Every structure is written in C-alpha cells, then in structure tokens.
Amino acid sequence: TFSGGCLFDEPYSTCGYSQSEGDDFNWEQVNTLTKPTSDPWMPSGSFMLVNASGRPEGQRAHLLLPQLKENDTHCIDFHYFVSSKSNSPPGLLNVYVKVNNGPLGNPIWNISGDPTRTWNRAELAISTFWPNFYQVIFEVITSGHQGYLAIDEVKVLGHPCTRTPHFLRIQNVEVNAGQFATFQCSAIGRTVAGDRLWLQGIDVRDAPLKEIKVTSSRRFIASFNVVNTTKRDAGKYRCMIRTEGGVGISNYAELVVKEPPVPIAPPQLASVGATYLWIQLNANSINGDGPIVAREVEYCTASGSWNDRQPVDSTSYKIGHLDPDTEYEISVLLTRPGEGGTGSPGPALRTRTKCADPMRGPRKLEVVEVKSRQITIRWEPFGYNVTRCHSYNLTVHYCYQVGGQEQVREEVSWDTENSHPQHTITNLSPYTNVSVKLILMNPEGRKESQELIVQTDEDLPGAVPTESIQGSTFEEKIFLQWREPTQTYGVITLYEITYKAVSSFDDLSNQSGRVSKLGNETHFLFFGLYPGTTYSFTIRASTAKGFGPPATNQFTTKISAPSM
Amino acid sequence: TFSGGCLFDEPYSTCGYSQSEGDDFNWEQVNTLTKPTSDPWMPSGSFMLVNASGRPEGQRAHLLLPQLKENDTHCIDFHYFVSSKSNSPPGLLNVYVKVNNGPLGNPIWNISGDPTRTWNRAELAISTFWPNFYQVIFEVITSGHQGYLAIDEVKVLGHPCTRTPHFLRIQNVEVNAGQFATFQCSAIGRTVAGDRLWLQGIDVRDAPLKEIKVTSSRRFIASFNVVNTTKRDAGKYRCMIRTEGGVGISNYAELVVKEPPVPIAPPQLASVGATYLWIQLNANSINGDGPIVAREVEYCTASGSWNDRQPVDSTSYKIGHLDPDTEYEISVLLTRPGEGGTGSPGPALRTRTKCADPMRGPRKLEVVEVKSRQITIRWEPFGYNVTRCHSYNLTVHYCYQVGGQEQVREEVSWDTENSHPQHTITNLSPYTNVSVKLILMNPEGRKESQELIVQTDEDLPGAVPTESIQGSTFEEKIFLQWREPTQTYGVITLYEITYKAVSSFDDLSNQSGRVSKLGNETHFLFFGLYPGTTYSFTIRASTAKGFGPPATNQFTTKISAPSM
Ligand SMILES: *[C@@H]1O[C@H](CO)[C@@H](O)[C@H](O)[C@H]1NC(C)=O
Ligand SMILES: *[C@@H]1O[C@H](CO)[C@@H](O)[C@H](O)[C@H]1NC(C)=O
Ligand SMILES: *[C@@H]1O[C@H](CO)[C@@H](O)[C@H](O)[C@H]1NC(C)=O
Ligand SMILES: *[C@@H]1O[C@H](CO)[C@@H](O)[C@H](O)[C@H]1NC(C)=O
Ligand SMILES: *[C@@H]1O[C@H](CO)[C@@H](O)[C@H](O)[C@H]1NC(C)=O
Ligand SMILES: *[C@@H]1O[C@H](CO)[C@@H](O)[C@H](O)[C@H]1NC(C)=O
Ligand SMILES: *[C@@H]1O[C@H](CO)[C@@H](O)[C@H](O)[C@H]1NC(C)=O
Ligand SMILES: *[C@@H]1O[C@H](CO)[C@@H](O)[C@H](O)[C@H]1NC(C)=O
Ligand SMILES: *[C@@H]1O[C@H](CO)[C@@H](O)[C@H](O)[C@H]1NC(C)=O
Ligand SMILES: *[C@@H]1O[C@H](CO)[C@@H](O)[C@H](O)[C@H]1NC(C)=O
Ligand SMILES: *[C@@H]1O[C@H](CO)[C@@H](O)[C@H](O)[C@H]1NC(C)=O
Ligand SMILES: *[C@@H]1O[C@H](CO)[C@@H](O)[C@H](O)[C@H]1NC(C)=O
Ligand SMILES: *[C@@H]1O[C@H](CO)[C@@H](O)[C@H](O)[C@H]1NC(C)=O
Ligand SMILES: *[C@@H]1O[C@H](CO)[C@@H](O)[C@H](O)[C@H]1NC(C)=O
Ligand code: NA
Ligand code: NA
Ligand code: NA
Ligand code: NA
C-alpha cells in the first residue's frame, strides 16, 4: 500500500502530483507512443517534460510528489533524461525535500545537468517518518539554452534502497557557545570511496565530514562538527550522503547553542574580618543562560601572591583564612552543563581585610650596656607576622624614682627595617632601677613585651656639705664629724680625709697625713695632735667608681697652762 | 576579646568551665602554692586535677570549656601533666570537639598517657566558626592504676596556631554508590614527615590519607578517599592532622551517597512494524534516586548479532531501521549526575517485529530444457533479504490450452536451501505455449517473478483416421484422399504413403512404391496403375520429430471392355 510513485501513463494528478503555480512555468506531461514525434532529442514513452527551448536563464518550474507519512523504511527512485540540441545544459535539475510543510530547504540532489540522450536511475533514502511527513519536489532551473529535461518513473517502495545507505534517526544536540558541536550519524548500508558526505542545514552554513567509522559492510558512523559555535549557528540540520546511484538524508535535528553564564553584578560585601570576608554571591541575575549546576568563588591578593578557586554552596559565603592588612579581589564563576559550561568570571568586588591586633610583644629584650645616666637595649625583629598590620609603631616604656617622685617616660623607635635593633635611653639618674618594656601598637590593639629591670650604673658622688663639717677640739686631739653628700648617686664606700697643720702659737709643723674610713660612719677622731695648732681638713666621699669632690674646713686645738 | 582560656587561679567557673555531671566522677581544682603538699607526684601551681588513685578501670570524668563561636582564625592551647607512682598510665586523656551541641564525636587528641613528671604544650586548630559553634571537652578514662593527671593553662588565642596547620572550610560531597568519594582538604601551614593525617567521622568508618600535595611552606592539599561507597557510608566527616605539638581539624562536611537510577518496570510496547518498534519508556517510576539528566534506550537482537545504545528524548520513542522477522530485547538506561551516574539497565521488553512483504519475485528465470510433455526451469536463489520473513513458500504458476479449454496449475518447490535451484513441470501437452511464473508468498504479501513463455516440444502425431481414407478409382488411376490426424501434437510436415498391388482379374503385379507430400494437402492422385487391380495404401503422417503411426486401406481400379 506504499504508493506515491508515477509511471505517467495515467495523468500525474492520479499519482498525487501537482504544480507549484507560484513559480515561473509548468512541467508538461507527454506520451510519445500515442502521439509520436519527429524531434530527435526526445525519447520514447510516457514522462513529464520540461521544454527549456526558447526559455531565458533563471526561469524555474516545480513538480511536487504528494506528502508521504510512512512508518517502515522505504526508498524512492526515479529516472531522468537530459538533451540538447547544442550540447549545453538546458537547465539544472534539483530535488528538494520539504518536511512538515516547512521551508523548501536546500536541495538534496541535483545534476548540472549536461545532455546524455540516455536515462538514469537515482534513488533517495529519506529518513523522515510518521508522525512527521515530507514532500519531494523536482525543480528545473533553465540555463537560457535550448534543450529538454525529463522525469519518467517515480517509484516509492516499501523496502530499503539498494545503492544508498540509510541514516538512523539523529537526535537534537545542545552545545555551549565557543565550543564545537558534533553530529553523529548512524547509518545502515555500505559506503564507498567515491561517496560525498556532509551535514545540511536550512538557513545556516553546512558543515563537512569530520570522520567516518565503518563497523561493517552493513553499518557505519559519520561524524560532523560545527566549529566555534555562536547563536547564529543554532538551527535545523540533517546528515547527507551521496553515492554514485543515490542520496540518503537523515531527519532534521536541532542545534541549540546556549551561552555560558556570567554574573551581571559583583558580589556584595556582607562583613569584613582580619582573617576573613563574608560576601554575598549575587550571581542570580546573570548574563548568559541555562541551569546553573555549579557556582565557584575565586579570589586573589592584589599583588598576585595567592589565588584560590573554591566551590560555594549557598548565597551567603565566607572566605576564611585570609591575611589581615591585605587587598583582595573576588569574582564569582557560574557553570551550566556541558563542555564549555563554566564561562567567564563576573565583575570583581575589591575589598581589603582589617588588621589583627598583634600576636605578641617583641622578644629577646636584652641589655647591651648600662651607664650612669643612660642605657642601651635590644630585641629580636618581627615583621608582618607579628604586627598583622602594615601600619604600626614600636614604643619603649620606662619607669623609675629620683628619689621622691616617680618619672614615667615613653619613646618611639624608628627601627622598622633593622637586623639586631637597638634603642639607647638617655637622661636617667644613676643607681636607680629603670623598669623597661616594649609596647607594640597597631590600630586594633597592643601587646607589651616582657618587663625588664636594669639598675643604672653608679657614679661619683657630690661633696660632703660644708655646713655639716663640724669639729670638737682638745689639746692634742680633734673630733671631726660630717654628713653624707646631699646627693650620692650610689653607695658611699669610703671617706678619704686629709689634714695639715697650718699654723700655731709658735714649727716645723710636719704633722700631716691622710686617713680613710668606711662610708657607714661620718666621723673621725684625730689621734695625737699638737696643742694651740690649727688644722685644715679636706674630706672626699667615694663610690664604687671612685672619689667625688672635696669639702674642707679647719679647726684649732685647745691650749692650756703648761705643767709643771 | 578572645577568651575561653583558664589559668585556674580563679575558680574554673569564672572561665566558663563546667562538669558533665552525668558521668562517673568530677575533676578537682587545686592550688599548691596556697595549700602546699608532701605528695611527690604532684607539681606546683594552679591546675585542674584528676586523682585516678583508688579508682577502678573504665571510670571517666569530663571537663568542658565554654562554647566558642568565633569569626577570625584562632588557636587553643593547653598544658598537661601525668604521674605515677607505679609507672603505669593512671588513665587516658581524651579531647573531644562537640559541634553545634550535636554528638560528642570521636576524640580529636589523646595521650595514652604514660607518666613523665613534666608539663607538655598542646594546641588545637579547630576550623568551626560563627554561625556554628563548638565545645572542647577534656576526658580522662581511668586505667585502674594509681596516679595523677592534670591540666593547667588553657589559652584561646585570636591568631593562628604556630605548630599546627589550619584547614580551610571543606564543603559537602555528593557521590554515586559503588564509586569512591574524595575529600580535598586545603590547609594553611607547614606539614612535616612525622605528621599523622586522616578523615574522621561520627558513627562511620574513618578513612586514611590518600595523598598530600605541598604547594609551599605556607600551604598544602591532603586528599582522602571513601571507597566503594554505600548509603551506610553517608554521614558527617572532617579532616585531621596531628603534628608533634598539636592537632588541626576541619569543619564537618556531609557525604551524600546517592543510588544510581534503575527503572522499576520495562518499556511498554506501543506498536509493531516490519522495520521498526514504537515503545513507551516508562522509566518514570524508578528504583534509585536523583535527577535524571539523561535517558538512553538499549536494544539487542536475540542472537546477539547487533546491539545499539541510543539516547532518547521523549517518553514515546521509535526504534527504526530494524530487521523484519527478528526477536528483539529492549531495556532502558537512566542517568543521574556524577561519575557512576548511569547505573543498571531496567527490565527488558522482549518483542519481535512483523514480516515485510517480499522485496520482489525471484530472477534469472531461465529454461534449462524443454520436452514433449515436460520442461525444467531455474532461477537465482534469494534468502532472508528477499523473503523478509523466515516463513514463506515459493510457487510455480503455469497456464495453457489443449486445445479447447484452459488449464491453470500451481506447484510448491522445496528448494529453500539450494545453489542453482530447479523445478521440472510435468504432464503437459506438446506444441503448446506454457506461460510460467514464480510467485513468492509470505504472510504479509507476495511478489511474482517475470512472466516466461515456453513452447512445449513437438512429438509424433496420431494416425490419419481410417474413416477419412476415401479413394476414387479409375481404369489406370486412383485418387486417394484423407483427413489430418485427429490430434497432431505439432505441425504436420509430410505424409509418407506407400501402395502395393495386391491382386487382379488375373501377374506379376510388381507395381509398388512409396510417395511423399507436403502436410498442407491431404490427397494423392495415383499416377499410372493397372486396371482391374486392387491396391493397398498405407499412410503415415509426420512432424518435425518424425513419423507417427499408420492408417491403411485398399481400393480397386475399374475395368472396361478392351479396345480394339
Ligand atoms: C519547445 O518550445 C518550442 C517553441 O520555442 C517548440 O518549437 C518546441 O517544439 C517545444 N518542444 C516541445 C514541447 O517538444
Ligand atoms: C504509521 O504508524 C502510525 C502509528 O501507529 C499509524 O497511526 C499510521 O496510521 C501508520 N501508517 C500510516 C498511515 O502512515
Ligand atoms: C549540486 O548542487 C550543489 C549546490 O546545491 C552544487 O554545489 C554541486 O556542484 C551540484 N552537484 C552536481 C550537479 O553534481
Ligand atoms: C612569618 O613570620 C615569621 C616569624 O615567625 C618570619 O620568620 C617570616 O619571615 C614570616 N613570613 C613567612 C612565613 O615566610
Ligand atoms: C602608633 O601608630 C599606630 C598606627 O599604626 C596607632 O594606632 C597608635 O595609636 C600610635 N601610638 C600612639 C598612641 O601614639
Ligand atoms: C633596686 O632594685 C633592687 C633589687 O630589687 C633593690 O634591692 C633596691 O632597693 C632598688 N633600689 C635601688 C636604689 O637600688
Ligand atoms: C659599718 O659597717 C661595717 C661593715 O662593713 C662594720 O665594720 C662597722 O662596724 C660598721 N660601723 C657602723 C658605724 O655601723
Ligand atoms: C587520691 O585519693 C586517695 C584516696 O584513695 C588519697 O589518699 C590521695 O591523697 C588522693 N590524691 C589527691 C587528691 O591528691
Ligand atoms: C562574628 O561575626 C558575626 C557575623 O557578622 C557577628 O554576628 C558576630 O557577633 C561576630 N562575633 C562573635 C560574637 O562571634
Ligand atoms: C589516640 O586515640 C586513638 C583512638 O581514638 C588511638 O588509636 C591512638 O593510639 C591514640 N594515640 C596516642 C595516645 O598517641
Ligand atoms: C542480503 O541480501 C543479499 C542479496 O542482495 C545476499 O547476497 C546476502 O547474503 C544477504 N545478507 C547480507 C547483507 O550479507
Ligand atoms: C505459503 O506459506 C506462507 C507462509 O509463510 C503462507 O502465507 C501462504 O499463504 C502459503 N501459500 C498458500 C496460499 O498456500
Ligand atoms: C504459441 O506462441 C506463438 C508465439 O506467440 C504463437 O504464434 C502460436 O500461435 C502459439 N500457439 C501454438 C499452438 O503454437
Ligand atoms: C502448401 O504449401 C506449400 C508451401 O510450403 C506450397 O508449395 C503448396 O503449393 C501449398 N499447397 C496447398 C495445398 O495449399
Ligand atoms: Na513511463
Ligand atoms: Na509551476
Ligand atoms: Na596555672
Ligand atoms: Na563529671
């Protein structure tokens, strides 16, 4: 029950055939073995003719089979004939296959077609089935030249073609723009060396055969790639094979070229930390299309040093484990399905992280040298890892008494860039306990070092006050007494004290000496002197580091009636 | 503002600490430099004690930090002390990290812990942040033996640990059952040769380190694989690293082990064709779980010869381009996302395709030899490709007349398995046009061969009827006449006819002969005979293949008065 053919003995109306009356001219129907003819370039029998004779170039005539709507594999075959006259093509012969009353589409078969005064078989293996349907259409386009073109036994047959393979139903293909798409055409039949293979589309560039894989004499697989795809490539396509005796075509199959996602606006900033960064992935309003199946966050330091791509599950996302006083650049990457699925990174939020209050105060706080009214200290350097902030300051903090009131000073060392840093404190009182500490400050907090204590070196004292130097005289002895120096600058270890006989009730007064005494007693009983004489005494106090300056005074011994 | 620590000078209540009063006994709080002690195995200072002395094995005591809920990277560190006595462990020391007031979980740190009469630092790098929270818990389990176990300066610090790395937040992992899952732990710190690494879970088997990749002194990536996964593997997991001076732990991250899809019931059969098969993919009611992201149909011939896996887009799906009288087996494959995503093929619909009516009638229908009443014919063999049905029959159909009525016979050749097949028709009439044709039949339709015509060979005729053999006599001559044989079986080419003088009015009658005559005239004028004599005549008709049988008769010449 598999008709649609036509031997053209009956009128072609009978076969379901018709003329596209919106073109230029009509095909003729002829029977030479009822009405014979002298014409040399006309063959015998019953056929449909196009007489291109007297016709200008470009003029075309269309002749349509009825619309077929089959289930089983079938094969259409027909015979054609061309003749001049001159010997030039009277016109081209095209065959189109319009499917589901859609566009005419590109032609699937054609001869150029030079004269041969001989008939020729040609079959078509169209793979378009119920519930879809298709219309075969024969078109002649006139060359301007003066010959004949004929069709003679169209035959629709409910079995596979014999000289052309058949394509198995090809399904739609989705692809991400930029990447290439591939059409895998399964076929059932033999293909040979001469056979031409390609992928045909309506209103889009046809693609060529990429490769062919011959599984057997009975079946093969031809692949076709549409390359560097855009939305302008998206459309309908079908596989093609032309063999010496026919042409096979697949169904149409749609290429959907979808554009990978990119987020419209950058990620909003939720809150800032020292070592973290809560952000808001916007990435809902997007610039491409398709189902987002994966969302990554990508961040890099402004210098470059570090960068990390990391998948994010929620809208609110925390970037933890960052560096404190650091400039960060964050973009969001979206991903749709398939090979080029991810696509570009969105606008970048640029933000920087707070400072952390410092790890700790500096360390190895040593004394280098101590002096009378000054000392030098030192410590181990530290850097970004202790400071946790590119802006900071280091401060030296000392404390002491002299002797009544306290004094509490602070300085600022500039040894930010220093191997074996130092700081020399000055303007101190001797023999005083300086309590030193290094306080490290940044805008968030502070950390003081270990507290060191350094006793300032001793020094030479002041002189014994001259008001204090009081003496008690006797014939033959003098008791000298004094008070400690108003300001000692150390422990008084010794008093050196000299005496000279200066005058007398007169001889030769060779009666001098020096004497010494522990610091803890401020007196000296002068032993065995001359009476009536006056002695000068000069005292000098002393400290571990030697003698201070001299007070001095004179006293004169008693006299008495001589005896006897 | 980063507290949670405890020096244990203040009561531990002050630090946020407490006792899990639903266990066996409580930790003690001690101050040896207010209340001194003779006990040799007790150190100086302010700490929390567990006195395992007098305690049986198994008995445990718990001591909880408060719950921390931080944002910035921090590091917990504490000091511990163990002493016997004997020299055996008075008990184990465990540390747990309970997160979001969930289960206690497995312990993250522990010493066995043999005596050393010395303190020991230990830090923890816990990566669980606001809005989540966690509780550190110190547990001692008594060994049965008689020693002391102590904790002395817990310190929460708002900076990274110094001797342990930190894990970056690990996200949840989905995996298909059967395949393995992988936990990629990003870390920030240094890891060394001695460090122990693993993946810890609550209520599931822990997995071991698969590999470690050291990007720098500052950061590395440790991978952990859960192998041959089932739903019994699905749960919460976190990364672990133990270093000589501490332990770092990631957040928990969920393993979701989903089961690949399999369809519950087979594909329903929609309609059957010769070269096709509309089916209904049920594959909606399914046996696994997850979003079906791809559906394939798979079919194979019952023999095996061909099988094809092909993606299907709709519920209703047509399998085209099949072989006719062929048993087919069809199962549906479903696919969910990820590495082991497809999973098994469903129940199989088993069905077979109809027959196609045959391609054509057989060919090269030749004559081999023709005979009088029989002939032999032959043709080219064909097979499944012409028959399109494993059940069929070939039939020989002939037609002829003899001579009045028609005869129309049909036979059935059994040369199903034959190189150069033959069939000898019999019981035919000679010199008759037999019109032969081979009709090939199967249950769907038929196709007759080309119609051949064979003229059956000639044969010897019948005799001339003896009623017809009439003669007219004269003195000296006889005119013999007859009719053609009632049934000639060919064209009569000759009549042979003999005559003998048999008697007379009496000598020596040597007066015989034979004569011949074209078939198209049935008479003979016998030339110059004797009068009064009687002649016997015997006629024999002839055909291309020779003489048929004889009719025969006698006539006698006239007499007359003699003259003169
Ligand atoms: C084609 O048209 C020309 C008129 O220009 C006519 O002479 C010729 O016979 C036609 N050929 C046909 C219809 O056979
Ligand atoms: C082809 O098969 C379809 C689906 O069963 C059926 O409806 C149709 O009538 C069949 N034959 C024709 C008319 O193409
Ligand atoms: C067939 O037509 C195409 C254009 O549709 C042309 O490229 C090709 O040369 C033609 N082939 C022939 C006539 O063999
Ligand atoms: C980080 O801190 C340390 C001090 O412990 C310093 O030696 C180093 O230069 C800093 N940077 C690194 C990790 O190289
Ligand atoms: C030192 O400089 C830091 C800036 O990094 C500032 O925070 C701090 O207050 C300064 N010290 C003082 C109190 O002068
Ligand atoms: C300095 O420190 C020492 C040691 O603490 C102490 O004995 C002494 O009294 C302090 N003052 C002076 C003036 O040395
Ligand atoms: C003072 O101290 C010294 C000890 O260095 C002792 O010899 C002497 O007796 C003391 N004298 C006084 C005045 O206390
Ligand atoms: C531990 O308990 C025992 C009692 O069996 C006691 O003698 C010992 O002093 C305790 N140790 C402590 C609390 O220091
Ligand atoms: C940590 O950050 C969160 C989110 O901004 C904030 O609500 C919380 O108060 C912060 N600090 C604390 C109390 O952990
Ligand atoms: C720590 O505890 C685990 C069990 O949780 C045990 O396998 C391991 O030996 C212990 N390690 C020590 C005490 O170093
Ligand atoms: C198919 O049919 C042909 C007849 O054209 C026959 O030669 C062959 O044995 C059959 N099977 C195949 C394709 O091998
Ligand atoms: C021959 O056998 C086929 C079975 O394949 C059957 O369809 C056909 O009708 C038979 N021929 C007749 C009419 O006896
Ligand atoms: C047989 O066929 C031939 C050729 O068609 C014909 O001329 C003849 O009359 C037919 N009949 C006999 C009896 O030969
Ligand atoms: C019969 O036919 C032959 C030709 O073969 C011719 O010689 C003869 O004259 C014919 N005679 C009759 C009786 O028609
Ligand atoms: Na015809
Ligand atoms: Na037209
Ligand atoms: Na303490
Ligand atoms: Na308890």
UniProtKB/Swiss-Prot annotation, chains A, B:
Q: How does it assemble?
A: Homodimer.
What's a GO cellular component annotated to this UniProt protein? Answer: cytoplasm
* Residues the record marks as carrying a glycan: 51, 71, 110, 228, 385, 393, 433, 510, 520
Single GO BP term: retinal ganglion cell axon guidance
Q: Where is the Ig-like C2-type domain?
A: 165-256
Q: Which GO terms describe its molecular function?
A: cadherin binding; identical protein binding; phosphatase activity; protein tyrosine phosphatase activity; transmembrane receptor protein tyrosine phosphatase activity
> Which top-rank group of organisms is this from?
Eukaryota
- Similarity comment text for this entry: Belongs to the protein-tyrosine phosphatase family. Receptor class 2B subfamily.
Native organism: Homo sapiens
Q: Describe the task this protein carries out.
A: Receptor protein-tyrosine phosphatase that mediates homotypic cell-cell interactions and plays a role in adipogenic differentiation via modulation of p120 catenin/CTNND1 phosphorylation. Promotes CTNND1 dephosphorylation and prevents its cytoplasmic localization where it inhibits SLC2A4 membrane trafficking. In turn, SLC2A4 is directed to the plasma membrane and performs its glucose transporter function.
What keywords is this UniProt entry annotated with? Answer: Cell adhesion, Cell membrane, Disulfide bond, Glycoprotein, Hydrolase, Immunoglobulin domain, Membrane, Phosphoprotein, Protein phosphatase, Receptor, Repeat, Signal, Transmembrane, Transmembrane helix
Q: Which residues form the MAM domain?
A: 1-163
Q: Where in the cell is it found?
A: Cell membrane
Main location, first listed in the record: membrane
Recorded protein name is Receptor-type tyrosine-protein phosphatase mu
| Stretches assigned to the Fibronectin type-III domain | 263-358, 361-459, 461-563
- Residue intervals annotated with topology Extracellular: 1-564
Q: Which span of the parent protein is shown here?
A: 22 to 588 of 1452
Kindly list the cysteine pairs connected by disulfide bridges.
6-15, 75-161, 185-239
